[PDB]
């Protein structure tokens, strides 16, 4: 669940 645009890496 990448629920913010810059959350994942």
């Amino acid at each position: 669940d990448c629920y913010l645009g810059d959350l994942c890496n």
Partner: antibody, heavy 114, light 114 residues
Framework: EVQLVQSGAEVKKPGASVKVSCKASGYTFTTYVMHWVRQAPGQGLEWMGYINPYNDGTKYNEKFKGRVTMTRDTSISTAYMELSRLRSDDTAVYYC???????WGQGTLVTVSS | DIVMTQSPDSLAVSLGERATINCKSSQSLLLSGNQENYLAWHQQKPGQPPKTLITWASTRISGVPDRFSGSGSGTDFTLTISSLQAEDVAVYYCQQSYSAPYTFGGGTKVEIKR
């Protein structure tokens, strides 16, 4: 039901600090970050930062980088926000919000006055 | 920082009539990796905590009535109220969740027209 329950209202004098809590239930606390968002009276909403409980990581708005600290306690599912050197225009209702701002706390009014 | 611009600032609408709130971002909110739009709509009444209505630009929060819907992509998003109810009088915010700081629009006040 997901619930974000914040501590109560504070009145502080200039220069003081305030630590506000937000206890989360209805889901697994470490699964989602916890944001803090404030609203000065009669103005809009403004993001301050978040803490990721899973790894204790933080991300602050460059507007409070040197004033705000966020913390968390995983064993009681509570996120904290501390604003130091309170000035008068820090008077606002402070909200915690989870994940992609899909659930909100009830707010904590902080009044900064001499 | 991404700038969120709403339009109009205040919207008068007759009871039962359609309400349209527009929100434009200075930057695309559509992540190309997963083809998702990072846009939420929040509802806020006088002296009340925000309440989330839409996330991912068009996903309705569980329990939000059908008359609310979100649409649009990239830089242009719309909140639609198909048939305005008395309980819908409030301020409505869009907020991007794409890149920090997670900025809000200026808000759109929605009032009963008379």
């Amino acid at each position: 039901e997901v619930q974000l329950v914040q501590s109560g209202a504070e009145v502080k004098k200039p220069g003081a600090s305030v630590k506000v809590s937000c206890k989360a239930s209805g889901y697994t606390f470490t699964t989602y970050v916890m944001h803090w968002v404030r609203q000065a009276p009669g103005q809009g909403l403004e993001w301050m930062g978040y803490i990721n409980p899973y790894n204790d990581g933080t991300k602050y708005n460059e507007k409070f980088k040197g004033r705000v600290t966020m913390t968390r306690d995983t064993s009681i599912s509570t996120a904290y926000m501390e604003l130091s050197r309170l000035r008068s225009d820090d008077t606002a209702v402070y909200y915690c919000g989870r994940r992609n701002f899909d659930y909100w706390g009830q707010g904590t009014l902080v009044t900064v006055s001499s | 920082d991404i700038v969120m611009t709403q339009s109009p600032d205040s919207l008068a609408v007759s009871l039962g009539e359609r309400a349209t709130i527009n929100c434009k971002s200075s930057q695309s909110l559509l992540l190309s990796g997963n083809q998702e739009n990072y846009l939420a709509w929040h509802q806020q009444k006088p002296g009340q905590p925000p309440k989330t209505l839409i996330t991912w630009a068009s996903t309705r929060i569980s329990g939000v009535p059908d008359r609310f819907s979100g649409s649009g992509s990239g830089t242009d998003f719309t909140l639609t109220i198909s048939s305005l109810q008395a309980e819908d009088v409030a301020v409505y915010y869009c907020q991007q969740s794409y890149s920090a700081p997670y900025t809000f629009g200026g808000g759109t006040k929605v009032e009963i027209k008379r």
